[PDB]
């Protein structure tokens, strides 16, 4: 239940963003022109937030009680804080190169990029329009109405159940995987925007989850949280194996794919297929000899069979397949102890981070001191304190 929003909160958040902006202008990182483009995103979401504050000049109560705007603002501060902890957590390894810290800064950057997309999507020109937000693919557009009416955002549980009615979600881990795919903003909430994107990416709706398991969960080709520059960097090791390719979410064309292949002449190119489902693109490209080695791999999964009335049976996907898939995204905000909830507490005398849920779960079973350094607890504290 995210609370009411008001200028003081928005400005609270704006100070934490500036902190993050200051962390990233460090030259040792040269992020001035790195794909998600964080030093452009924070200033940009800040500047758009002011616009929202302007359009609601005098209607700040209305705005402040908007479920979406409330969930948004909560998540924006949560994420600007993960970032701050990230730089503090990993220290100099941040200025390394190809390091986990920096790997996570990019995942986060990618999230900020999506967050700002969703924001501009729901608050075009500053005015809230989520209740009239136009889902692109009519079939999905129905599912949403008939299930959330004009709702701009729904809890993961509500969405998952609503979806299960029409697209059976096999089991436990499948739902988790499906979630780290649709929850672009990573806030356990699914927005009408987040939904429109996902339903475009994995069209046609008629086979929504079949497509999603064949293209993303299992397909060695699919890459999660990758930017234009990381693809180029990844395909580098196959620059001598023309035909090697990988695909991912386009960042400047949300809801569209970006395929990166190595050419005959040994170059790495990237394209955003026009008017056609990813799999027709991948089948055709394969047939035409362009896409042959998913992430370098020699066997290229057959996607024919995502075609015509009542298209085949459901591929089997192990619990291991889903686990490996989930480990693709986020995770760094996750608590090492349970590996499922966000770290939200910093044990104090020492300093270990962990989800409050576990801290509480350990003490209740009488576990001596800190779960990490079995040292005395004394007091807890926010992983990242509010701006002073």
């Amino acid at each position: 239940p995210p609370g009411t929003v008001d200028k003081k909160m928005v400005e609270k958040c704006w100070k934490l963003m500036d902190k993050v902006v200051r962390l990233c202008q460090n030259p040792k990182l040269a992020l001035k022109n790195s794909p998600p483009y964080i030093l452009d995103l924070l200033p940009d979401t800040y500047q758009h937030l002011r616009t929202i504050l302007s359009r609601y000049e005098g209607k700040m109560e209305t705005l402040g009680e908007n479920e979406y705007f409330r969930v948004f603002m909560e998540n924006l501060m949560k994420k600007t804080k993960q970032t701050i902890s990230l730089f503090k957590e990993g220290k100099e390894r941040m200025y390394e190169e190809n390091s986990q810290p920096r790997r996570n800064l990019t995942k986060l950057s990618l999230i900020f990029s999506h967050m700002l997309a969703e924001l501009k999507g729901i608050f075009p020109s500053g005015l809230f329009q989520g209740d009239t937000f136009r889902i692109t693919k009519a079939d999905a557009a129905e599912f949403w109405r008939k299930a959330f009416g004009e709702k701009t955002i729904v809890p993961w549980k509500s969405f998952r159940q609503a979806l299960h009615e029409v697209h059976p979600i096999s089991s436990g881990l499948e739902a988790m995987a499906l979630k780290s795919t649709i929850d672009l903003t990573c806030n356990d909430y699914i927005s009408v925007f987040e939904f429109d994107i996902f339903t475009r990416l994995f069209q046609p709706w008629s086979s929504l989850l079949r497509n999603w398991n064949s293209l993303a969960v299992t397909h060695p080709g699919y890459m999660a949280f990758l930017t234009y520059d990381e693809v180029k960097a990844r395909l580098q090791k196959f620059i001598h194996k023309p035909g090697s390719y990988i695909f991912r979410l386009s960042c400047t064309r949300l809801g569209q794919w970006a395929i990166g292949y190595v050419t005959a002449d040994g170059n790495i190119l990237q394209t955003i297929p026009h008017n056609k489902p990813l799999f027709q693109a991948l089948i055709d490209g394969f047939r035409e000899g362009f896409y042959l080695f998913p992430d370098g791999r020699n066997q290229n999964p057959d996607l024919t069979g995502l075609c015509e009335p009542t298209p085949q049976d459901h591929i089997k996907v192990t619990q291991e397949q889903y686990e490996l898939y989930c480990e693709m995204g986020s995770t760094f905000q996750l608590c090492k102890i349970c590996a499922e909830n966000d770290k939200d507490v910093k044990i104090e005398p020492c300093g270990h981070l962990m989800c409050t849920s576990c801290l509480t779960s350990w003490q209740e079973s009488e576990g001596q001191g800190c779960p990490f350094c079995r040292c005395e607890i004394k007091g807890t504290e926010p992983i990242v304190v509010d701006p002073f």
């Binding site: 190119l269 394209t271 297929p273 362009f290 896409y291």
Partner: peptide, 9 residues
């Protein structure tokens, strides 16, 4: 910087 090209021939 970047570059998105047309879909393969």
């Amino acid at each position: 910087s970047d570059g998105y090209t047309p879909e393969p021939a």
